[PDB]
Design a protein around this ligand. Structure first.
Ligand SMILES: NC(=O)c1ccc[n+]([C@@H]2O[C@H](COP(=O)([O-])OP(=O)(O)OC[C@H]3O[C@@H](n4cnc5c(N)ncnc54)[C@H](OP(=O)(O)O)[C@@H]3O)[C@@H](O)[C@H]2O)c1
Length: 325
């Protein structure tokens, strides 16, 4: 059973993960400096012990600032905090994996991260530019080799630089390539995918459960609806009639119902908010539960429509979303 004070769930490698985390993507060009750092401090104060970030969000140093300040004020110990970082597509070449993680440790000013994941299964041309395209707008890809990249990840774990290893945006075929690798040393413990009542991931979730992989739900509130990335043809999740009526049964908001839904089925949720009130709101999901009927009601909202389709990379040989799951 899950409580505000105790809500970690086991990972297959013997580690554990707080089932709610603070998401920290925020559009760089429109986000004030300091907003992430403040939000992470507010979150930790509120009771969050998990923060999800990425070097390419351009605010990973702010996460470190926040975490190190709360440690310094003896609010938490490093051991109490779970940070997840990610290896971007431009950094999949095996010899670049460790230097890339070390860059994030410098940025964080921390000695290890709790979870390091392959951010997408697609390899992009190495370089500073996170979204490399040539003069004719053609995407500059690299040939993926998930097993060789995974081997470099394993070596980072053996060097003490990360406690747990995982993936993100992997489909079943891509998981199976790693799970079936000869000489596999560390199985992936986590797969971070989009997941919410309009995209409940029934087949992928079940597959991961069968392999002792925990799913982390990104965009668990249905995203910030940024038209650069988001399928806005889908309606806003938090305006869903049913979720809002379900919220009235418990004096909860649609967001609180949506987060409770996923954590209740052992899915980790990493809602992003840089708003003081909503950071708190999002954490108040341990003082109620959904009935089994309500869990079925919400599952039935599944449209099998993703808000985050990544359509610009549909031609990459390892584009994950052509397969059924
Ligand atoms: N691995 C990947 O490929 C990947 C991809 C996308 C995202 N992620 C991760 O997952 C995290 C979460 O997803 P996301 O940021 O896309 O989306 P999200 O968490 O689903 O929701 C984001 C939006 O919800 C708003 N919001 C937050 N709490 C709310 C509440 N209680 N009521 C109404 N509105 C609320 C936020 O605005 P305010 O900030 O103003 O509250 C923001 O506009 C990211 O921040 C990132 O850490 C991973």
């Amino acid at each position: 059973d899950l409580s505000a004070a105790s809500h970690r769930i086991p990972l297959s490698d013997g580690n554990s993960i707080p089932i709610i985390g603070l998401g920290t993507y925020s559009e760089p060009k429109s986000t004030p400096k300091g907003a992430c750092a403040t939000s992470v401090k507010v979150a930790i104060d509120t009771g969050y012990r998990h923060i999800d970030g990425a070097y390419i969000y351009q605010n990973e140093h702010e996460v470190g600032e926040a975490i190190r300040e709360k440690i310094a004020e003896g609010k938490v110990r490093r051991e109490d905090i779970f940070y997840c970082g990610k290896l971007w597509a431009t950094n999949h070449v095996p010899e670049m994996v460790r230097p890339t993680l070390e860059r994030t440790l410098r940025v964080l000013q921390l000695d290890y991260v709790d979870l390091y994941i392959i951010e997408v299964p697609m390899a992009f041309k190495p370089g500073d530019e996170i979204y490399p395209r040539d003069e004719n707008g053609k995407w500059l890809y690299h040939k993926s080799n998930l097993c060789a990249t995974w081997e470099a990840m394993e070596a980072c774990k053996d060097a003490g630089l990360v406690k747990s290893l995982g993936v993100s945006n992997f489909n079943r075929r891509q998981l199976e390539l790693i799970l079936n690798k000869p000489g596999l040393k560390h199985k992936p413990v986590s797969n971070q995918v989009e997941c919410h009542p309009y995209f409940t991931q029934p087949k992928l979730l079940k597959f991961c459960q069968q392999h002792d992989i925990v799913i982390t739900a990104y965009s668990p509130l249905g995203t910030s609806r940024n038209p650069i990335w988001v399928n806005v043809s889908s309606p806003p999740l938090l305006k869903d009639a049913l979720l809002n009526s379900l919220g009235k049964r418990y004096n909860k908001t649609a967001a609180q119902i949506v987060l409770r839904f996923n954590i209740q089925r052992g899915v980790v949720v990493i809602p992003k908010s840089f708003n003081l009130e909503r950071i708190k709101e999002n954490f108040q999901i341990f003082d109620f539960s959904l009935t089994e009927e309500e869990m079925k009601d919400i599952e039935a909202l599944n449209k099998n429509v993703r808000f985050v389709e990544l359509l610009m990379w549909r031609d990459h040989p390892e584009y994950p979303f052509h397969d059924e799951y």
